[PDB]
């Protein structure tokens, strides 16, 4: 397991899973290529009634209507396809492991969505995969896509050394 690495801003390499360990109910990461892909993940603690919360994403101050009816944490993918388009909750990962993953591969961005321990992967298209950089607000790990089933196991069951 490569990591843990402290919060930083960098352009992740293609074909590597970025496994982020969220530690608070704020902005988990900000990922964009500044042309056609903007994704910021906000973490919602369990049992949150519909509320407007303010988040700083991509240098802007945005308001999101968020909620969480579950016992688990919810990580909301806020997406827009242009700097002028409005953010919307495109995907959600409901998790008690607090692990979030993002991968650049095959001209697409891959993340985990659904509910642990049965979260699965999905893709978003982009015309500029190379320029996708990320601002990671928490500790994170780097896993080669050749070991994705290990990343899948971490996303759904958490980081465990003992069985």
Per-residue mark of binding to a copy of itself, 58-97 (x: CB under 8 A): xxxx------------------------------------
Residues 6+ apart with CB under 8 A from 97: 116, 154, 155, 156, 157, 158, 159
Q: How far is the CB of 24 from a copy of itself (least distance, A)?
A: 5
Residues 6+ apart with CB under 8 A from 149: none
Q: How far is the CB of 118 from a copy of itself (least distance, A)?
A: 17
In the set 29, 30, 126, 136, which binds a copy of itself (CB under 8 A)?
Answer: 30
In the set 36, 139, 150, 153, which binds a copy of itself (CB under 8 A)?
Answer: 139
Give the position of tokens 């659904």.
Answer: 114
In the set 117, 131, 150, 153, which binds a copy of itself (CB under 8 A)?
Answer: 131
Bridge partners of 88, per DSSP, are 79
Q: Does 105 bind a copy of itself (CB under 8 A)?
A: yes
Site for a copy of itself in 109-128 (CB under 8 A): none
Run of H or E including 21 = strand 16-21
Helix (H, G, I), strand (E, B) or coil at 75: strand
Q: How far is the CB of 64 from a copy of itself (least distance, A)?
A: 11
Bridge partners of 10, per DSSP, are 134
């Amino acid at each position: 397991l490569d990591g843990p690495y402290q919060p930083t801003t960098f352009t992740p390499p293609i074909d590597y899973w970025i496994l982020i360990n969220s530690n608070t109910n704020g902005v988990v990461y900000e990922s964009t290529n500044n042309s056609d892909f903007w994704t910021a993940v906000v973490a919602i603690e369990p049992h949150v009634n519909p509320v407007d919360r303010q988040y700083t994403v991509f240098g802007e101050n945005k308001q999101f209507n968020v909620r969480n009816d579950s016992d688990k944490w919810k990580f909301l993918e806020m997406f827009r396809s242009s700097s002028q388009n409005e953010f919307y909750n495109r995907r959600t990962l409901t998790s008690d492991t607090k692990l979030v993953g993002i991968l650049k591969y095959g001209g697409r961005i891959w993340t985990f969505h659904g509910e642990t321990p049965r979260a699965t992967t999905d893709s978003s298209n982009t015309a500029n995969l190379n320029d996708i950089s990320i601002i990671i607000h928490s500790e994170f790990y780097i896993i080669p896509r050749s070991q994705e089933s290990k990343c899948n196991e971490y996303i759904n069951n958490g980081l465990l050394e003992h069985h």
